[PDB]
């Protein structure tokens, strides 16, 4: 606390207010198509989402 300055800096725009949905990390993030995951946690769930490495 207290309430007026505990989280007062605005977490609008910028990579300080975008986190990976799996691992809560803020670097290397893929926001295209509304993934909102990191670039490594995408490669775990690449097939479970349904992307296929064709070429």
């Amino acid at each position: 606390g207290h309430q007026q300055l505990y989280w007062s800096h605005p977490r609008k725009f910028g990579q300080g207010s975008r986190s990976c949905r799996v691992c809560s990390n803020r670097h290397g993030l893929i926001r295209k198509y509304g993934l909102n995951m990191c670039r490594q946690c995408f490669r775990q769930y690449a097939k479970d989402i349904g992307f296929i490495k064709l070429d």
Binding site: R43, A46, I49, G50, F51, I52, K53, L54, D55
Partner: peptide, 10 residues
Amino acid sequence: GSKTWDRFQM
């Protein structure tokens, strides 16, 4: 690494 990209598509 040797900069090997990874082309996923759907």
